[PDB]
Design an enzyme around this catalytic site. Structure first.
Site, short mmCIF file in Angstrom:
data_model
loop_
_atom_site.label_atom_id
_atom_site.label_comp_id
_atom_site.label_asym_id
_atom_site.label_seq_id
_atom_site.Cartn_x
_atom_site.Cartn_y
_atom_site.Cartn_z
N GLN A 236 0.82 -1.13 -0.02
CA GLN A 236 0.01 0.12 -0.08
C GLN A 236 0.86 1.45 0.17
N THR B 109 3.18 -6.84 3.58
CA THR B 109 3.52 -6.89 1.94
C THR B 109 4.64 -6.59 1.65
N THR C 14 2.57 2.69 13.31
CA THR C 14 1.29 2.07 12.98
C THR C 14 1.34 0.69 13.07
N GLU D 274 -4.12 -6.78 -1.83
CA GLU D 274 -5.21 -6.45 -1.73
C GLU D 274 -5.83 -5.42 -2.94
N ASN E 158 8.54 7.97 7.63
CA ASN E 158 7.47 9.17 8.11
C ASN E 158 8.20 10.14 8.83
N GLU F 37 26.96 5.46 -12.21
CA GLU F 37 27.92 6.55 -12.11
C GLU F 37 28.05 6.90 -10.69
N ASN G 171 4.76 11.43 0.35
CA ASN G 171 4.66 10.77 -1.00
C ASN G 171 5.10 11.99 -1.78
N1 LIG Z 1 5.17 7.40 2.97
C1 LIG Z 1 4.11 6.73 3.27
N2 LIG Z 1 3.96 5.72 4.16
C2 LIG Z 1 3.11 4.85 4.20
C3 LIG Z 1 1.89 5.27 3.62
N3 LIG Z 1 0.97 4.29 4.03
C4 LIG Z 1 1.41 3.57 4.70
N4 LIG Z 1 2.87 3.96 4.94
C5 LIG Z 1 3.58 3.36 5.94
O1 LIG Z 1 3.69 1.90 5.75
C6 LIG Z 1 4.06 1.39 7.18
C7 LIG Z 1 3.12 -0.04 7.27
O2 LIG Z 1 3.00 -0.65 6.01
P1 LIG Z 1 1.42 -0.70 5.25
O3 LIG Z 1 0.79 0.51 5.39
O4 LIG Z 1 0.56 -1.85 6.28
O5 LIG Z 1 1.64 -1.33 3.89
P2 LIG Z 1 2.41 -2.72 3.51
O6 LIG Z 1 3.76 -2.54 3.75
O7 LIG Z 1 1.96 -3.04 2.15
O8 LIG Z 1 1.77 -3.73 4.48
P3 LIG Z 1 0.04 -4.32 4.31
O9 LIG Z 1 -1.12 -3.14 4.15
O10 LIG Z 1 -0.06 -5.36 5.18
O11 LIG Z 1 -0.07 -4.86 2.92
C8 LIG Z 1 3.50 2.32 8.16
O12 LIG Z 1 4.17 2.37 9.27
C9 LIG Z 1 3.37 3.51 7.30
O13 LIG Z 1 4.52 4.36 7.78
C10 LIG Z 1 1.94 6.15 2.58
O14 LIG Z 1 0.72 6.54 1.92
N5 LIG Z 1 3.03 7.00 2.37
MG LIG Z 2 -1.79 -3.17 2.45
#
Ligand SMILES: Nc1nc2c(ncn2[C@@H]2O[C@H](COP(=O)(O)OP(=O)(O)OP(=O)(O)O)[C@@H](O)[C@H]2O)c(=O)[nH]1
Ligand SMILES: [Mg+2]
Ligand SMILES: Nc1ncnc2c1ncn2[C@@H]1O[C@H](COP(=O)(O)OP(=O)(O)OP(=O)(O)O)[C@@H](O)[C@H]1O
Ligand SMILES: Nc1nc2c(ncn2[C@@H]2O[C@H](COP(=O)(O)OP(=O)(O)O)[C@@H](O)[C@H]2O)c(=O)[nH]1
Ligand SMILES: Nc1nc2c(ncn2[C@@H]2O[C@H](COP(=O)(O)OP(=O)(O)O)[C@@H](O)[C@H]2O)c(=O)[nH]1
Ligand SMILES: [Ca+2]
Lengths: 439, 50, 66, 54, 33, 412, 429, 429
Positions: free
Chosen positions: A11, A145, A179, A71, A206, A254, A228
C-alpha cells in the site's frame, strides 16, 4: 536507453508510486490520460520520457512501472482515480487477501502465488527496454506485503536479472511513532533482503518527513499525500540526471560507484532542499550555499538519524536548476570548513556532485514552492547504525518472551529465522562501526 | 397523475449517528407479533400489486 | 501417480503444487456438499483443553542467496 | 371489549431545520486547486537528444 | 432514592490537541562551531 | 452462424418472444457530473408500464471496471394528465385527476423526446429531472399502444416544438410553456448581446457571451441554471453599455434608472417560474426565475444535438477527475495555439503569449482556484456557436482547438 | 474479502437487526432491497455484506438462527425485516430455556444441520470469504451454547478464515438470568479455543454510556444496540471503503492478539455526545482519542486503570491527516506509559478510512486487549464456583446429557486464562 | 431421431399426461394438435415426440397402458387428452388388483401382444427410432408388472435401441400399498437386466422438495407430476433443440453407466425455488450447481452424503459460457473428493442446449449414478425379507401362478445389487 523500471510494492509503495508518477507526468508533459502534447517535446528525436514512459503507436505514454499489492484496496483507487487511463490495465497486479502485517504471510504463503506473475510483468517491462539502468523498488518494510513479498521479489529479481542495479526506497519504522505492533518484526525480517538483494538502500521513514513538513512547509496538517509528494520529488531529483542534460551528468552506476564503498555498506540516507512553502520562499535567501547548508543540516534530512553524531563516508549532491559549478564547489568548501560533520579518515574527498539544468516542477495543489535551484543528498554515513541499533532494541524487547511470534511460526517460518535476521542486523551494525572506527 | 406524483415522493431517512436515536419504537401501542415463521410459507415477503 | 496441475492455470484446488502465477485470483463461486454433524455432536465427547483447531502450514526451509 | 388504542405517531418534522441535515455518504466534493505552469526554456529545452548522425 | 447503576470507574487517559512540543516529535541538539 | 453472436437472451436462443420497446436516454442538466451519467429503460405495452435505470462502470472483483444498473425509476404505470391546461383543475379533486390521468404511449418513446418521471426515486437526483431519449429499439416490439383518453398529451422534442420552455414544476409529466417575445424585447436582447460582444469580451464575441454567462454559473438541484432579478440586473450592469459620469449626479441617476427598467423589461419578457414560499426555514425558496437555456436560445441562437455533444465530448476528454471541472493547467497544456495559423504562417501572435492570453480569458472560480466549470466551458462554446453557422465548421473547430487524444473514454 | 454474519439468540438477532439497519443506511439500501444510496464509493465494495440478485436487490449475508421463532418474527416484521433471505431463517419448535446444555447438545444439534447447510452456502456464495462474524449473548441458552456449537463447526470446516464473536457478557448487577454464570463459563472456553477474536460487550457499560455519556431519558434496546452496530460497522469500514491506511480482520487479529489465548477485547465508540453537548465540544482528532481512551466510554464494564493495555487498535474514519492521529496515539502512550506494557513498544495499532460514517465528520472504533478483563473473568469464575459448589441449577445441565466434569474443565480454562492475564500484566522486561 | 414413450399403469398415465402437457407447451402445440408458437426451433425437431398427420395434426408418439380404463378416461377428459391417438389407448376389462402377479403373468400377457403391436407400429412410423421410453411405478400392480413385461419384450425385439424407464419408487412414509416390497423386488430384478438405465423417483422426496424448497401451501399431485415431467423433458433437451454441446440418451447412458448392472440414477432440477424466496436470489449457473448437488433438491430420497458419485450428468438449458458451466462441475469434485470416486476422474459429464424451458432464465437436469441407491435397495430388501419370512400377502402372488423360487432369486439379485454398489463405495484405487 537509460530506462529505470519502477516497482511499487504494498500500500505504502502504491501511494508513493502514485505521487511519483503524478510528478513525472507533469514533469515530462504526459497528461493524466497518458497522452502527450506535441509541444511538450523538442522535436521528433526528443527522448526524455523514454526512461519512464514507453510511447505507444496510439499516442499513449505508458509508464514503466509495476504496481503490486496483495489487496485491491489501492489498485481500485488507482483505477478510479485520475490516472486510470494513464496506467496500463496490466502491470497493476493485486491479490485477494492482504498479508496483514505478516512477513510470513507475505513471503511464504501468499507472496509465493504472486511472485511469478510479478516477475512476468517485470520481464515484459524490461524486454521493452534496450538500455535499462536498473530497478527502483518503492516499499515500506513496516507492513506485511512490503516486507515479505518485497523480499521475495527482490530475491528473485537478483537471481534472474544478474547484476542490474537496484535502488530500494524503503520506509523504515520511525524511532517514536508507528502504526503496527509487529513492525519491528517485519523490519528485522526484511533487513536481510534490503542488505543483500537491494543494491542501494534508501531510508524514507515518515518521521523526519512529518517533522520537515511541520517546520519548513508551514503545514498544520501533514499527511501521507504530502510525504509521498516529497518522496517523489526526491526520486525525480535523483533520477533527472539521465532525464535532462547538465554540466555534470551522472547515471545509476555513475553515482553508485562513488556512493558505495563496500558491498555490504550501501544503506544511504537522503535529504532534499529547499523544501519550503510558498510563503517562506519569498522570505529567505535561496542561494546554492543556503540550500547546501540546509541539506547538511539534519533538519532537511528524510531519516531520523543525526549525521553530526556520526561520520560521513560519501555524500552525493544532485543539484538541479540554475546551479553553477562555482557555487557547488564553494558550498562544498564551506561544508568542509564546518566541523559539526566529519568525513571518514580513509575518504579525503567524500564528495560527488551532479549538476542538472532542469529545475524541479511543482505539482498543482502541491506544497513545495518551485525554486529555480534545488539539491538532493544521497549520503553514506556511519551514523546510520543508530536506527539499526534502535530497531534491534525494539526487536529484542518484543522477542524477549516471544510475543506475536505464533503467526510467523504458523504461516511457514521456522523459529530460528528471527534469530538469524537479528544476528544479521547486529553484524550489519557492527560492520558499520568497524568501517567508521578510526585507523 | 398528481396523486401518483405525491405517492412517488418519499422522505429520505436521517443518518443513523450512534446515540442520537431516542427510542422511537416505544410509541406503538399494539405489539402483537404475527407468527410469520413456522406456520407461514411465504414468510411475509412483500410483493407489489400487478 | 498424480502428475500435478499445469502451469499458468486459472483453476484452483486445495493443498496441491501451485504455480507462482495468481491462480487464486480466478477462483469462481463453488457449490459445496454438506456433511452430517448433528449425529457426530455428542455430549460425552466434549471440548478438551488445547483441542482447538489451529491452521498451521508446514514450515519448509528456504535457502537464502548471499 | 374496548377497542385497542391507535399507535402514537411521531411528527415527521420535529426540528424547524431538519431539511438542511444532509443524508449523503459523500456530502462535500473533493477539494482540488490548480496553478498554470510558468512557460520558459525549461519546459521543452534541457531534454536528452539522440540522433543517428544521418 | 432510586440511583442509577453506574460502573465504578473513573477516567485515567488524557491527551491534548497539539500535545508534543512545537508539533516536532524530536528536535536535534545543536553542537556549536 | 445464427447463434454464434447470440447472447443468453437472443431471439433465436429464447423459445419465448417478448413485447417491449427499449430506450436509452440521458439526463439534461448543466451539471457535467450528471451529463456524464447514462440511463437505460424499457416500456412494456401489455401493462403500459416502463422502467428506468442508471448504469455505472466501477471495478468488480476481477480488478476491471464493470457496468451495473441502479434503479432510477422502478417499473410502474406512470400517468400524465391529458389536458395540460386542466392539470391545475384536476390537481384539486381526486376524481378529476383520475379522469384526466393517462398512461404513456409508445409514440411518446421516440428519439429526442424529453420525458419527465416526476420526483426522483433515488438520491442521485435532488429534484425532478428531464430525460432526453438518445436511442430507441423496437425490434422486440409487436404492438402499438393507443391512449384511451380523447385528448392526447404526447412528449415532443424541443426542436419539434420550438419557442417553448419545459417546466417540470408546474405540471406532472412535463409540459411546455410558450415563450413570446416582441420585436422590441428581441432587438433589445440583440443589442445587449452585441454590447457584451464589444465591451466585456473585447473584440472576441466568444469571450463576450462567456462574460454574459458570468452571473448565471450556479446550477440548481434540477439543473436549469436560473435567472433571478438580481442576476438580471447584474447582467445589465455587465452589458456595460449603460454608463454614466460618476461626477454628474443627474447622469448617474439616469443610468441607474435605465439599468432598472432595462432589467424589468428583460425579466418580464420571458416566462417566469412561480416563486415558492416554504413554511419551514429548511426548505429552499426559489424566486421568480427564467431559464438560462431559453434566454440564450434567443440571445445566441439555437444549438443542435451534434454541436452540444461535441462540446460535451471535448469537456469530458479534458476532464480526468470526472468532477465537471477542468484545471487551468490542463487548459494551458491543451490549447494548440502553437500550431495556430496566426503564430505559424501569420506571425501576428506568438505561441506562448497567445496561450497565456487564453489562460487569462478564463475567470477565476471563487470556490476552487484554477478550476474551469462545465458552465464556463458551455458558455465559451456558446460563443463559437453564436458566431458561426456551419455545424461542420463547429465540429472542425472543436477537433482542432484542443490537442485532445480523441480516444473513446465514455464508459458507454 | 466478504464477511458473513450469523446472529444467534434473541440478543444476537436484535444486535444483528440493528447492525443491518445501520449497514443498509450506510450503503443506501432500501428495506425493500433496492439500492437508494448516495455516492459511487458505496457500491464499490458493497459485496462484503450484500449479495446481489437478478433484479439488483441486495440481500445480506446474514444467518438468523435461534430456537425461538418469536425473535425471527419480530425482526422480519420490523422496519428492515424484508431485507433478509427466507431460507436464512432457522427455527426450532421449542425454546432453549436459557439452558446452555439444551441449546448446545439437544435442541441445537438437530438445527445445526440446516444451520450449516445454509451457512456453507452463504460462505461459498462469495468470491473470497474474509471471515465469519457471530453476534450472541453468553448468558442465554440458544445464543450462547448453540452459537458456540456453530462457531466450533465453522472453525472445523474453515480453519484459516478469521472469526469474530460479538458476545454480550452479563453482569450480576444486571443479571437477567440466574444460570448466567453456568452459560457464560461454558461458552467462554469455547470462544477461547475456537474464536479468533472475541468481542466482550457488557450491559452495565452500555447503560453507563447511555446515562452519563449520552444522558438519554428513556433509552431502549434499540438505542443500546445502536452502539454495537456502530462498532460492528467500524471494524469493517476499512474493508468496505478505501482509506489512507487500510486494514482488515486479520490485520486487527495479528496486531492485537499477542498470544493465542489472549483474544478478548473491550469496545468503545467516538464521537458520542450528550443531548445538549454538541455546542460545548469541538469534534477533532484530539477529542476523538480522548473519548476513545476515556474510561466510561468503554462499552465493556471493566476499569482500565487496574490493568495494563496489552494491545490497542483505533480504526479512525473520515478525511484526516495521519500526523495528528498518530501524534495523539503516540502521546497517549507517552504520558500514560504506566497504563501500557513496556515490553511491547507501541502497543497501539492505527488504521485510517477515508469515508466517515453517515453524517459524522469523524469517528473511531477502539479494540482493547486490556489485562483488566481478567477482573470480569474472575468475577464470572467466583460466582461459577458459588453455583457449582452447591449443585444449584445443575440438574438441568446434567439431565440434558452433559457430564459434571464439563463444568470443571471449563472453569479450569477460566483459571488458566486469568492466570495468563495476571502473569502477563505483572511481567517485567 | 425419434423417442416413443409408453405410460404403464395409472402412475405412468398421469405422469405421461403431465409430460405431454409440458412438451406441448414447450413446442407450442395446442390440445387440438396445431402449432401456435413463435419460434422456428419448435418445428425444427418436433418429430422427436410428435408425428404429423395428413391434416397437420401432431399426434404424440405415445402408448398408454393400464388394466383400468378409468385412468384412460381421465386422461381423455384431461385438457390435452385429445392429442393422443385413439388407437394407442390399450386397456383391459379387470383391474390389476395392485398385484405384480396378475399385472405381469395372467392379465399382462393377454394385452402384451396388442401393446407390442402398437409400439412396433410406432417404431415403424419413426424414421429411425433412437429410444423407447417408459413411465411407471415399481410399487404398483399394472405399472410394475406389465411395465417390466413390456420392457423385457422391447429388450428382445430392439436390442440396439435405448430403453429409458422412469420408475416411481415407494417409501415407508409414503407407502400406500402393502405389497410395495413384493412389487419392487419383482420389478427391480427385471429392470436390472432389461433397462439400459433407470433413474428412481420417490414421493417423499417430491413432497420434501415441494414443501421445504418450493413452499407451496397446497401443492397438488398435478404439479408434482409437473416437477417430474420437467426433468423428463429436459433429459432430451439437446435431442429436441440445438446446443453448443449436444448429447442424447445413449450419450447419457455411456457416460453414466460404468458397468451394465449399475444404472440406477436420480433426477435433479434447478432452479427449483420457492416464489417467496427467488425474488431474493440471483439466478446463476453456480447456484444451479448448488441446487443440483444439494441434498434437499435430490428428488430421490437418498442422500449423497453417505454415498460416492460413480458418475453424474448435467444437462443445462440456456445459452451459457462453457467454463462457467464447467468449473461448477469440476471444482465440486475438487473440493468434495470424499464424496467422489477417485478411479473415475471427472465424474460429471456436461451438456449444453440453447433452448431453456418456458419462463426461465436457464435450467439444468441432473442425473446421478450415486452409490446411495444401495440404501433404497437395502431398505426394500429388508422390507421384502420381513414380509416373506412370514409369507405375508404371498398367497395373492402364488395363486396367480408364481413359485417361491422367483421371489428368492429376485431378492438374491437385489441383494447382489446392493453388495455391488457397496463394493465400489468402499473400493480402493
Ligand atoms: N510515505 C508513506 N508511507 C506509508 C503510507 N501508507 C502507509 N505507510 C507506511 O507503511 C507502514 C506499514 O505498511 P502498510 O501501510 O501496512 O503497507 P504494507 O507494507 O503493504 O503492509 P500491508 O498493508 O499489510 O499490505 C506504516 O508504518 C506507514 O509508515 C503512505 O501513504 N505514504
Ligand atoms: Mg496493505
Ligand atoms: N454550450 C453548450 N454545450 C453543451 N451543452 C450545453 C450548452 N449549453 C447548455 N447545455 C446543456 O444542454 C442541455 C440543453 O438544455 P435544454 O434541453 O433546455 O435545451 P433546448 O434549447 O430546450 O433544447 P435542445 O437540447 O433540443 O437544443 C442542458 O442540460 C444545458 O445545460
Ligand atoms: N444489547 C442487547 N442485549 C440484549 C438484547 N436482548 C437480550 N440482551 C441481553 O441478553 C441477556 C439474556 O440473554 P438472552 O437474550 O436470553 O439469550 P438467548 O436466550 O440465547 O436468546 C440479558 O442479560 C440482556 O442484557 C438486545 O436486544 N440488545
Ligand atoms: N409421480 C406419480 N406417482 C404416482 C402416480 N400414481 C401413483 N403414484 C405412486 O405410485 C405408488 C403406487 O402406484 P399404483 O397406484 O399402485 O400404480 P398402479 O398399479 O398403476 O395403480 C404410490 O406410492 C404413489 O405415490 C402418479 O400419477 N404420479
Ligand atoms: Ca477535474
Amino acid at each position: 536507453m537509460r530506462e529505470a523500471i519502477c516497482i511499487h510494492i504494498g500500500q505504502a509503495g502504491c501511494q508513493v508510486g502514485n505521487a511519483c508518477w503524478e510528478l513525472f507526468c507533469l514533469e515530462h508533459g504526459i497528461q493524466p490520460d497518458g497522452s502527450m502534447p506535441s509541444d511538450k517535446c523538442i522535436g521528433v528525436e526528443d527522448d526524455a520520457f523514454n526512461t519512464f514512459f514507453s510511447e505507444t503507436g496510439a499516442g499513449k505514454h505508458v509508464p514503466r512501472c509495476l504496481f503490486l499489492d496483495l489487496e485491491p484496496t489501492v489498485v481500485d483507487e488507482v483505477r478510479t482515480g485520475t490516472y486510470r487511463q494513464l496506467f496500463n490495465p496490466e502491470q497493476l497486479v493485486s491479490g485477494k487477501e492482504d498479508a496483514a502485517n505478516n512477513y510470513a504471510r507475505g513471503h511464504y504463503t501468499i507472496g509465493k502465488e504472486i511472485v511469478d506473475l510479478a516477475l512476468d510483468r517485470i520481464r515484459k517491462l524490461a524486454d521493452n527496454c534496450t538500455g535499462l539502468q536498473g530497478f527502483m523498488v518503492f516499499h515500506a518494510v513496516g507492513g506485511g506485503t512490503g516486507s515479505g513479498l518485497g523480499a521475495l521479489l527482490l530475491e528473485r529479481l537478483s537471481v534472474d536479472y544478474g547484476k542490474k542495479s537496484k535502488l530500494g526506497y524503503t520506509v523504515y519504522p520511525s524511532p517514536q511513532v508507528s502504526t503496527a505492533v509487529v513492525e519491528p518484526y517485519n523490519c528485522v525480517l526484511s533487513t536481510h533482503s534490503l542488505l543483500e538483494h537491494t543494491d542501494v538502500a534508501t531510508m524514507l521513514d515518515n518521521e523526519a518527513i512529518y517533522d520537515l513538513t511541520r517546520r519548513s512547509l508551514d503545514i498544520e496538517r501533514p499527511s501521507y499525500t504530502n510525504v509521498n509528494r516529497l518522496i517523489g520529488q526526491v526520486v525525480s531529483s535523483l533520477t533527472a540526471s539521465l532525464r535532462f542534460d547538465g554540466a555534470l551528468n551522472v547515471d545509476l552506476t555513475e553515482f553508485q560507484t562513488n556512493l558505495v564503498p563496500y558491498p555490504r555498506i550501501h544503506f544511504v540516507l537522503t535529504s532534499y532542499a529547499p523544501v519550503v512553502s510558498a510563503e517562506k520562499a519569498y522570505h529567505e535567501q535561496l542561494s546554492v550555499a543556503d540550500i547546501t547548508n540546509s541539506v547538511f543540516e539534519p533538519a532537511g534530512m528524510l531519516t531520523k538519524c543525526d549525521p553530526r553524531h556520526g561520520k560521513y563516508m560519501s555524500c552525493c549532491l544532485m543539484y538541479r536548476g540554475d546551479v553553477v559549478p562555482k557555487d557547488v564547489n564553494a558550498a562544498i568548501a564551506t561544508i568542509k570548513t564546518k566541523r559539526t560533520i566529519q568525513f571518514v579518515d580513509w575518504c579525503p574527498t567524500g564528495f560527488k556532485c551532479g549538476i542538472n539544468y532542469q529545475p524541479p516542477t511543482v505539482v498543482p495543489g502541491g506544497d513545495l514552492a518551485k525554486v529555480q535551484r534545488a539539491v538532493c543528498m544521497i549520503a553514506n554515513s556511519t551514523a546510520i547504525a543508530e536506527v539499526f541499533a534502535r530497531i534491534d532494541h525494539k526487536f529484542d524487547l518484543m522477542y524477549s518472551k516471544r510475543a506475536f511470534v505464533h503467526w510467523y511460526v504458523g504461516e511457514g517460518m521456522e523459529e530460528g529465522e528471527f534469530s538469524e535476521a537479528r544476528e544479521d542486523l547486529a553484524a550489519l551494525e557492527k560492520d558499520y562501526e568497524e568501517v567508521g572506527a578510526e585507523s | 397523475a398528481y396523486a401518483q406524483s405525491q405517492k412517488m415522493q418519499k422522505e429520505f431517512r436521517l443518518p443513523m449517528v450512534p446515540g442520537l436515536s431516542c427510542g422511537e419504537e416505544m410509541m406503538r401501542r399494539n405489539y402483537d407479533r404475527s407468527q410469520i415463521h413456522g406456520v407461514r410459507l411465504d414468510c411475509a415477503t412483500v410483493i407489489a400489486g400487478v | 501417480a498424480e502428475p500435478g496441475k499445469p502451469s499458468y492455470s486459472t483453476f484452483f484446488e486445495k493443498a496441491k503444487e501451485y504455480d507462482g502465477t495468481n491462480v487464486r485470483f480466478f477462483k469462481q463461486r463453488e457449490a459445496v456438499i454438506g456433511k452430517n454433524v448433528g449425529d457426530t455432536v455428542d455430549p460425552q465427547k466434549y471440548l478438551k483443553k488445547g483441542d482447538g483447531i489451529r491452521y498451521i502450514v508446514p514450515a519448509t526451509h528456504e535457502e537464502k542467496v548471499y | 371489549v374496548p377497542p385497542r388504542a391507535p399507535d402514537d405517531v411521531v411528527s415527521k418534522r420535529p426540528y424547524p431545520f431538519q431539511a438542511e441535515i444532509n443524508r449523503k455518504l459523500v456530502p462535500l466534493p473533493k477539494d482540488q486547486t490548480s496553478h498554470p505552469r510558468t512557460l520558459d526554456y525549461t519546459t521543452v529545452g534541457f531534454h536528452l537528444i539522440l540522433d543517428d548522425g544521418n | 432514592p432510586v440511583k442509577p447503576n453506574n460502573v465504578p470507574r473513573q477516567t485515567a487517559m488524557f491527551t491534548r490537541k497539539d500535545p508534543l512540543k512545537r508539533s516536532l516529535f524530536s528536535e536535534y541538539p545543536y553542537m556549536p562551531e | 452462424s445464427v447463434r454464434m453472436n447470440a447472447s443468453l437472451y437472443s431471439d433465436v436462443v429464447r423459445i419465448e418472444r417478448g413485447d417491449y420497446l427499449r430506450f436509452h436516454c440521458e439526463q439534461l442538466s448543466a451539471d457535467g457530473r450528471d451529463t456524464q451519467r447514462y440511463f437505460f429503460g424499457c416500456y412494456y405495452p401489455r401493462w403500459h408500464g416502463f422502467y428506468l435505470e442508471e448504469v455505472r462502470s466501477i471495478i468488480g472483483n476481477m480488478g476491471y471496471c464493470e457496468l451495473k444498473h441502479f434503479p432510477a425509476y422502478p417499473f410502474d404505470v406512470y400517468l400524465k394528465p391529458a389536458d395540460v391546461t386542466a392539470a391545475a383543475d384536476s390537481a384539486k379533486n381526486c376524481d378529476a385527476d383520475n379522469a384526466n390521468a393517462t398512461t404513456y404511449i409508445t409514440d411518446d418513446f421516440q428519439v429526442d423526446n424529453i420525458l419527465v418521471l416526476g420526483p426522483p426515486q433515488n438520491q442521485r437526483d435532488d429534484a425532478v429531472k428531464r430525460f432526453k431519449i438518445v436511442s430507441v429499439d423496437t425490434s422486440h416490439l409487436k404492438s402499438k399502444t393507443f391512449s384511451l383518453a380523447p385528448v392526447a398529451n404526447l412528449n415532443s422534442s424541443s426542436v419539434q416544438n420550438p419557442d417553448t420552455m419545459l417546466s417540470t414544476l408546474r405540471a406532472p409529466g412535463g409540459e411546455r410553456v410558450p415563450v413570446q417575445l416582441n420585436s422590441s424585447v428581441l432587438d433589445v436582447l440583440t443589442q445587449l448581446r452585441d454590447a457584451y460582444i464589444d465591451h466585456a469580451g473585447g473584440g472576441i464575441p466568444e469571450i463576450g457571451i462567456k462574460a454574459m454567462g458570468r452571473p448565471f454559473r450556479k446550477v440548481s438541484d434540477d439543473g436549469r441554471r436560473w435567472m433571478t432579478r438580481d442576476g438580471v440586473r447584474q447582467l445589465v450592469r455587465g452589458s456595460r453599455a449603460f454608463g454614466a459620469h460618476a461626477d454628474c449626479l443627474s447622469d448617474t441617476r439616469h443610468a441607474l434608472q435605465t439599468i432598472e427598467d432595462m432589467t424589468d423589461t428583460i425579466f418580464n419578457a420571458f416566462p417566469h417560474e412561480e416563486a415558492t414560499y416554504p413554511v419551514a426555514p429548511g426548505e429552499e425558496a426559489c424566486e421568480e426565475r427564467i431559464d438560462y437555456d431559453v434566454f440564450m436560445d434567443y440571445i445566441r441562437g439555437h444549438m443542435n444535438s451534434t454541436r452540444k455533444k461535441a462540446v460535451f465530448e471535448v469537456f469530458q476528454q479534458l476532464d480526468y477527475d470526472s468532477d465537471s471541472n477542468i484545471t487551468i493547467k490542463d487548459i494551458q497544456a491543451t490549447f494548440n495555439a502553437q500550431e495556430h495559423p496566426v503564430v505559424v504562417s501569420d506571425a501576428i501572435f506568438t505561441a506562448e503569449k497567445l496561450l497565456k492570453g487564453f489562460l487569462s480569458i478564463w475567470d477565476e472560480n471563487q470556490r476552487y482556484f484554477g478550476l474551469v466549470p462545465y458552465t464556463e466551458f458551455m458558455d465559451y462554446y456558446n460563443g463559437l456557436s453564436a458566431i458561426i453557422e456551419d455545424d461542420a465548421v463547429f465540429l472542425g473547430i472543436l477537433k482542432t482547438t484542443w490537442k485532445v487524444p480523441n480516444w473513446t473514454i465514455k464508459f458507454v | 474479502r466478504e464477511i458473513v454474519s450469523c446472529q444467534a439468540g434473541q440478543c444476537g438477532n436484535q444486535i444483528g437487526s440493528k447492525f443491518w439497519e445501520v449497514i443498509s443506511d450506510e450503503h443506501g439500501v432500501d428495506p425493500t432491497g433496492t439500492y437508494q444510496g448516495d455516492s459511487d464509493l458505496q457500491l464499490e465494495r458493497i459485496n462484503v455484506y450484500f449479495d446481489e440478485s437478478s433484479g439488483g436487490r441486495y440481500v445480506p449475508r446474514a444467518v438468523l438462527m435461534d430456537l425461538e421463532p418469536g425473535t425471527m418474527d419480530s425482526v422480519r416484521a420490523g422496519p428492515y425485516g424484508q431485507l433478509f433471505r427466507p431460507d436464512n431463517f432457522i427455527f426450532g419448535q421449542s425454546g432453549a430455556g436459557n439452558n446452555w446444555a439444551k441449546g448446545h447438545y439437544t435442541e441445537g444439534a438437530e438445527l445445526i444441520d440446516s444451520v450449516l447447510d445454509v451457512c456453507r452456502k452463504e460462505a461459498e456464495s462469495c468470491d473470497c470469504l474474509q471471515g465469519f462474524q457471530l453476534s450472541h449473548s453468553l448468558g442465554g441458552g440458544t445464543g450462547s451454547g448453540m452459537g458456540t456449537l456453530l462457531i466450533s463447526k465453522l472453525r472445523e470446516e474453515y480453519p484459516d478464515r478469521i472469526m469474530m464473536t460479538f458476545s454480550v457478557i452479563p453482569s450480576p448487577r444486571v443479571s437477567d438470568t440466574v444460570v448466567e454464570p453456568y452459560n457464560t463459563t461454558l461458552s467462554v472456553h469455547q470462544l477461547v479455543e475456537n474464536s479468533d477474536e472475541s468481542m466482550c460487550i457488557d450491559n452495565e457499560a452500555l447503560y453507563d454510556i447511555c446515562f452519563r455519556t449520552l444522558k438519554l431519558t428513556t433509552p431502549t434496546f434499540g438505542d443500546l444496540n445502536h452502539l454495537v452496530a456502530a462498532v460492528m460497522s467500524g471494524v469493517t469500514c476499512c474493508l468496505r471503503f478505501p482509506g489512507q491506511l487500510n486494514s482488515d480482520l486479520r490485520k486487527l487479529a495479528v496486531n492485537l492478539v499477542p498470544f493465542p489465548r489472549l483474544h478478548f477485547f473491550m469496545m468503545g465508540f467516538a464521537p458520542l455526545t450528550s443531548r445538549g453537548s454538541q455546542q460545548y465540544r469541538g469534534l477533532s482528532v484530539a477529542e476523538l482519542t480522548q473519548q476513545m481512551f476515556d474510561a466510561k466510554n468503554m462499552m465493556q464494564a471493566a476499569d482500565p486503570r487496574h490493568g495494563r493495555y496489552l494491545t490497542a487498535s483505533a480504526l479512525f474514519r473520515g478525511r484526516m491527516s495521519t500526523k495528528e492521529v498518530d501524534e495523539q496515539m503516540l502521546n497517549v502512550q507517552n504520558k500514560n506509559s504506566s497504563y501500557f506494557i513496556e515490553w511491547i513498544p507501541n502497543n497501539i495499532k492505527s488504521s485510517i478510512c477515508d469515508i466517515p460514517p453517515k453524517g459524522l465528520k469523524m469517528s473511531v472504533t477502539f479494540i482493547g486487549n486490556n489485562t483488566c478483563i481478567q477482573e470480569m473473568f474472575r468475577r464470572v469464575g467466583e460466582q461459577f464456583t458459588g453455583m457449582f459448589r452447591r449443585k444449584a441449577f445443575l440438574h438441568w445441565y446434567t439431565g440434558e446429557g452433559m457430564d459434571e466434569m464439563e463444568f470443571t474443565e471449563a472453569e479450569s480454562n477460566m483459571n488458566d486464562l486469568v492466570s495468563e492475564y495476571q502473569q502477563y500484566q505483572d511481567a517485567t522486561v
